[PDB]
Design a protein around this ligand. Structure first.
Ligand SMILES: *[C@@H]1O[C@H](CO)[C@@H](O)[C@H](O)[C@H]1NC(C)=O
Ligand SMILES: [Ca+2]
Ligand SMILES: [Ca+2]
Length: 432
C-alpha cells in the first residue's frame, strides 16, 4: 500500500511510477504494469543479485526504501522527504534510483541536492538535467535528448530529407525537442523546417483528427519528411493515421516508452541501445502472490494483469506469461545498471576508505554524498546486457542509439543502423 522497506548496512532509495496520475484531485490512478511494476522489480532483482555477489560489496548488504511517484512531480517531492527522516530505526539513504519521468526527476533532484544525496535515473532524458550548476547530484544511465536531437538531424541529412515538417505532442517535452532539433538544424546547414505543427492535449471532451493533421503535413510544399516528437498515445495514432493516408510519406519519430500494429511502412525511429536481461525474466515470471509479498503493490498488479479480483476471481494459480502476455519492459536493463552503478561506486568508496571490515567504516559513513557522487561519476563496468556503463562530466550516459525501421517485406521494426561516435546507416537493410 505504501512502500518497500528492506534493511541493510546501506540503504538505496527508489522512485518508480507504480501508478499513473489519478483523475483530478486523486494523486494516484491505475497500476502501470510495465513502467511501474517491471521497473521496480528490476531494482529488487538487482539488489538480490548484488546481495548474493561475493566479489561486489562482499561484506556490505544493500537495503532499500522504494516509493511510488504516482507519475506526479509534486507527489514525488513529498515522498522524497522520507529519504531524509534520519536527519529531520531512522532510515539513512545514501543514494536514490529514479525517477522515471523527466519532470519528476527534476523536482526530486532539486530537493536531493539540498541534502547532498546522489541520484541516478534509469529513464529521464530531459537535457536540462545535464547542467551541473542546477543538478550536480544527478546522473543517468540513459543519454540526454540533446544527443538524440543531433542524431535525428544527422539521419535526416544523410537520407536527403532537406525540407521537413515537425509534429510534436503538447507539453514541455515536445516543445523542447522541436526547439532543440530546430536549433541544431540551423547550425548544420542544408536542412530547413517547412512548418511546426502541435498536437492538442488529450482532452476527454474531444477526439483529435490525426488524419487531417497528417494530410496537411503530407501536402506541405517542399517537405520531404515529417519529424515526430510524441508521447505514447499520440505516436500510435500518428503512425496509424500515416498508414491510412492517401499519400506515402517519410516519417522519423522519437519519444514514447517502448523498447498486431497499424504503422506506416518505412517509419523510422531512433532510441537508446538496450537489450533483454534474461535472468530478470526468469525471476519476474516466477513471481506469485505466495512468494512475492515483498512487492507491496503486487496484489494490485495481479488483479490488473489477470483481470480478476482478490467479475472473475483470482485463484493465485495464474502465471505471468502463461495466463497473460509478457515481454520484458525496455528499460529493465537501465534500472539494473543504475543500481549496479550505485553498487560499484559504493564498492570503490569502501575499498578506498576501508579495509578488512564487516560492513561500513565510520570513515565511509562520514564521507557523505559529495564524495559518493565522485565515485558514481567515475564508475566504468560492463552492465546487465554486457555493454559498458559510464558517465560523462555532466553525469550523462554517452549518446548510443539504435535506428529502426518498420518493414513489411517478410512485419515489424528492423534494425537499420546506429549512432555512436559515427552514424552507421545500413542503406541495404532499409526498405525502398
Ligand atoms: C571481508 O571479510 C573478509 C573476512 O573477514 C576479509 O578478508 C576482507 O578483507 C573483507 N573485505 C572488505 C572489503 O572489507
Ligand atoms: Ca555482495
Ligand atoms: Ca547532472
Amino acid at each position: 500500500p505504501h512502500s518497500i522497506r528492506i534493511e541493510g548496512d546501506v540503504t538505496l532509495g527508489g522512485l518508480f511510477p507504480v501508478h499513473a496520475k489519478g483523475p483530478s484531485g486523486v494523486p494516484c490512478g491505475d497500476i502501470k504494469r510495465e513502467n511501474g511494476i517491471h521497473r521496480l522489480e528490476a531494482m529488487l532483482y538487482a539488489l538480490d543479485q548484488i546481495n548474493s555477489d561475493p566479489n561486489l560489496l562482499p561484506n556490505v548488504t544493500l537495503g532499500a526504501r522504494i516509493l511510488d511517484t504516482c507519475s506526479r512531480d509534486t507527489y514525488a517531492l513529498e515522498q522524497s522527504l522520507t529519504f531524509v527522516q534520519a536527519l529531520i530505526k531512522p532510515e539513512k539513504v545514501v543514494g536514490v534510483i529514479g525517477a522515471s519521468g523527466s519532470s519528476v526527476s527534476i523536482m526530486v533532484a532539486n530537493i536531493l541536492r539540498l541534502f547532498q544525496i546522489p541520484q541516478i535515473s534509469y529513464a529521464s532524458t530531459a537535457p536540462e538535467l545535464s547542467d551541473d550548476r542546477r543538478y550536480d547530484f544527478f546522473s543517468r544511465v540513459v543519454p540526454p535528448d540533446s544527443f538524440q536531437a543531433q542524431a535525428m538531424v544527422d539521419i535526416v541529412k544523410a537520407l536527403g530529407w532537406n525540407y521537413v515538417s515537425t509534429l510534436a505532442s503538447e507539453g514541455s517535452y515536445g516543445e523542447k525537442g522541436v526547439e532543440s532539433f530546430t536549433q541544431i538544424s540551423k547550425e548544420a546547414g542544408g536542412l530547413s523546417i517547412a512548418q511546426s505543427v502541435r498536437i492538442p492535449q488529450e482532452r476527454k471532451d474531444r477526439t483529435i483528427d490525426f488524419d487531417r493533421i497528417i494530410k496537411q503535413l503530407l501536402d506541405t510544399p517542399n517537405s520531404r519528411a515529417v519529424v515526430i516528437f510524441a508521447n505514447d498515445e499520440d505516436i500510435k495514432q500518428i503512425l496509424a493515421a500515416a498508414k491510412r493516408a492517401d499519400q506515402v510519406g517519410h516519417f522519423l519519430w522519437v519519444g514514447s516508452d517502448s523498447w498486431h500494429e497499424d504503422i506506416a511502412e518505412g517509419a523510422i525511429t531512433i532510441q537508446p541501445k538496450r537489450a533483454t536481461v534474461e535472468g530478470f525474466d526468469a525471476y519476474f515470471t516466477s513471481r506469485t502472490l505466495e512468494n512475492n509479498r515483498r512487492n507491496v503493490w503486487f496484489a494490485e498488479y495481479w488483479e490488473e494483469n489477470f483481470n480478476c479480483k482478490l467479475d472473475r476471481k483470482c485463484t493465485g494459480q495464474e502465471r505471468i506469461g502463461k495466463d497473460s502476455n509478457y515481454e520484458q519492459e525496455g528499460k529493465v536493463q537501465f534500472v539494473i545498471d543504475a543500481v549496479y552503478a550505485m553498487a560499484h561506486a559504493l564498492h570503490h568508496m569502501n575499498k578506498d576508505l576501508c579495509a578488512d571490515y564487516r560492513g561500513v567504516c565510520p570513515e565511509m559513513e562520514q564521507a557523505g554524498g559529495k564524495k559518493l557522487l565522485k565515485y558514481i561519476r567515475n564508475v566504468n563496468f560492463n552492465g546487465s546486457a554486457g555493454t559498458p556503463v559510464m558517465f560523462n562530466k555532466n553525469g550523462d550516459a554517452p549518446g548510443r542509439y539504435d535506428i529502426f525501421q518498420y518493414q513489411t517485406t517478410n512485419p515489424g521494426y528492423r534494425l537499420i543502423g546506429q549512432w555512436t561516435d559515427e552514424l552507421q546507416l545500413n542503406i541495404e537493410d532499409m526498405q525502398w
